[PDB]
Design goal:
- This is part of a larger assembly, with chains A, B, C, D and E.
- By secondary structure, chain A is α+β, with helices and mostly antiparallel strands.
- Chain A has a domain at about 10-105: Double Stranded RNA Binding Domain (2-Layer Sandwich).
- Chain A has eight helices and nine strands.
- In chain A, a hairpin with a 2-residue loop joins strand 5 and strand 6 (about 135-140).
- Chain A starts with 7 loop residues before the first helix and ends with a helix.
- Chain C has one helix spanning about 75-85, and strands at about 15-20, 25-30, 35-40, 55, 65-70, 70-75.
- Chain C is mainly β.
- The longest helix of chain C has 10 residues, at about 75-85.
- Chain D has helices at about 10, 30-40.
- Chain E is α+β, with helices and mostly antiparallel strands.
- Chain E is built from four helices and six strands; from the N terminus they run αααββββββα.
- Chain E is elongated, with a radius of gyration of 22 Å.
- Chain E starts with 9 loop residues before the first helix and ends in a 7-residue tail after the last helix.
- The relative contact order of chain E is 0.15.
- The chains are: A alpha+beta, B mainly alpha, C mainly beta, D mainly alpha, E alpha+beta.
- The interface between D and E is small, with 8 and 8 residues.
- The structure holds two RNA strands.
- Chain D: It is found in: Cytoplasm; Nucleus.
Amino acid sequence: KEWLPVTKLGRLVKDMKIKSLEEIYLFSLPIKESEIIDFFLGASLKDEVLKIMPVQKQTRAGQRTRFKAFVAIGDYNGHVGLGVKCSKEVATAIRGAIILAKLSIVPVRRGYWGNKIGKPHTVPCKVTGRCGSVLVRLIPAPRGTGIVSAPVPKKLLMMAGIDDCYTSARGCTATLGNFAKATFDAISKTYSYLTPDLWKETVFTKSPYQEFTDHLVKTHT
Amino acid sequence: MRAKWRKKRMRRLKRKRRKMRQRSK
Amino acid sequence: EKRELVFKEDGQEYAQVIKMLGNGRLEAMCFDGVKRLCHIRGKLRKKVWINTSDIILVGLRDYQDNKADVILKYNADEARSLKAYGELPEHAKINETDTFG
Amino acid sequence: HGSLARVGKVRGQTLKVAKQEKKKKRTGRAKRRMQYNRRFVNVVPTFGKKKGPNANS
Amino acid sequence: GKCRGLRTARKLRSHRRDQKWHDKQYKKAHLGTALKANPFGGASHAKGIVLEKVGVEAKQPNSAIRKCVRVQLIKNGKKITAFVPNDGCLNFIEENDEVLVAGFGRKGHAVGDIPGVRFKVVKVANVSLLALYKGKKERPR
RNA sequence: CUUUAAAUCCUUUAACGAGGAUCCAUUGGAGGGCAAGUCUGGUGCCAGCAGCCGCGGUAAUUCCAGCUCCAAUAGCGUAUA
RNA sequence: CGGGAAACCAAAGUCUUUGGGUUCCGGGGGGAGUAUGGUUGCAAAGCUGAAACUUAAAGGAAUUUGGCGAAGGGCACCACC
């Protein structure tokens, strides 16, 4: 029942030393357990399955069908993720899809439109993503417009906490996995676009590896 | 049926009908 | 198993094929001296074959006298027993499937 | 059998059952509210694909 | 475009006109032959006279006898077959009467497993076929 | 009573006037797109449904009838521009 | 580096973060490079070039068993020496 970790990040988040996962996103440390997310995010992390499809390799004994399951994850205050797991039984494929979506959640920032009043509601710039042959655009919107898109990026943008935007899609958007990954790597690009208010020189604080290393090396071997 | 002999048959049919039209007048 | 010899109805008059054409179409010279292009049913597509010079229980159309529909195909012994009954006349052409006509 | 050219045979030889009593209307203020609260509050679907309101099983 | 001059308008307009002429849906609506060859002559519905009842077969694997009606038009005078829609409704139509025909739903193309038809039957003998099938009305003698 | 060339339409006001308030709300659908039944009985690649995939083979979530249910609801469905 | 559906590409790159300039050319697959009209040519034949009708597929890249009158190996006294 009780969790015992593998890496050092498990000790760092269980010894009441990592206050928030924004430090992990700042230092871009890789994550390899679906349970630091359980520690930092509570019941706000919903799970809704997108699509179940069969994939078939076929041999002399006929086709054997493993099942591919897309799921999209994310709390409604920021972070949103996606994960694809394919196996034979439906339930373990669904559970592995939840786990792999739970690892790869990306933080997002939200901007304004026209005037910078109140809490942010839309994406700050025009960002896109590239995978396969599909295009997903994220155009900022005036307040109260809502998300206008296909139902799958409607689900993704409502789950991510985006109140409103404008989209446009090009290409063979019938393949839902490629289209969902295009939306995922489009919304993950809302950081990687330098804006003039981020122009000042950053300061580097102490890394969490340097923060408690003497306690870390004595609390695990 | 490849395109070479299909073109040859259409050419022969066109030549035959053109000869029949020019000798019919 | 020896099935029961079903009889004709008003629209199931006895007929015999004289020549089979292509395109999945069958043509039979009926016993009333009429010719019908007789269409093969879904059950009779690949499970059984209508060979030539055999009697065919055709299905007539009540609104046109051009096409027929098939009801059932008969084997040789049931055809000979129906011949011995006398429902169909003496000018039938089985003749141990002769090709002369 | 008669022929294969008969029309309306399934319409012809089928059974006949008369109609029943008369239902109540109030222009959708409870006809759809009943199925809404059954779908959203009363009937709780188990984790899976879907669940319908006309499940006669 | 790829011809991108500031004083290039007539070349772009002529190229757009030619490449729009190289089409199918625009060429159907902006040519006289595509409407002249239409049996209705550009009309929605048309009336006709029944001359012969023809029964046609079906296409590949799905095989059934579909029953249609050969109609001669009033405004034009060409024999055009028409498919009676519902179950057992061929008993209503007799020969040498009046029938109202209309399209079946793909803008002038064969639909489903019936080979070589385009048009269905809506009204026969100046009464609706739906009321004849349902039982709300009855064919006058 | 009023309006109006004179009325009818509407507004106003007497006497009547709802408990299956019979003073009776229809149109297309129920496999996927596309909200809504492995319901029952009948013919069982026939009859038919189906704008597209496809359902019809005597275990029909699609045909033909009865029950329930969803959609807009005095409106709804179909065809041609 | 980057791009593409992928084979692949220092160009097939600098493309939703689209805009250096400028000719020809394609809108599902058949019908069909066919008929007619013009034009060129001794002849053969080149150039321009449809429609009616029909169909829900025709096509491009690539992974697993399949099958070779393709090649390369391994094993067996129910194959051989």
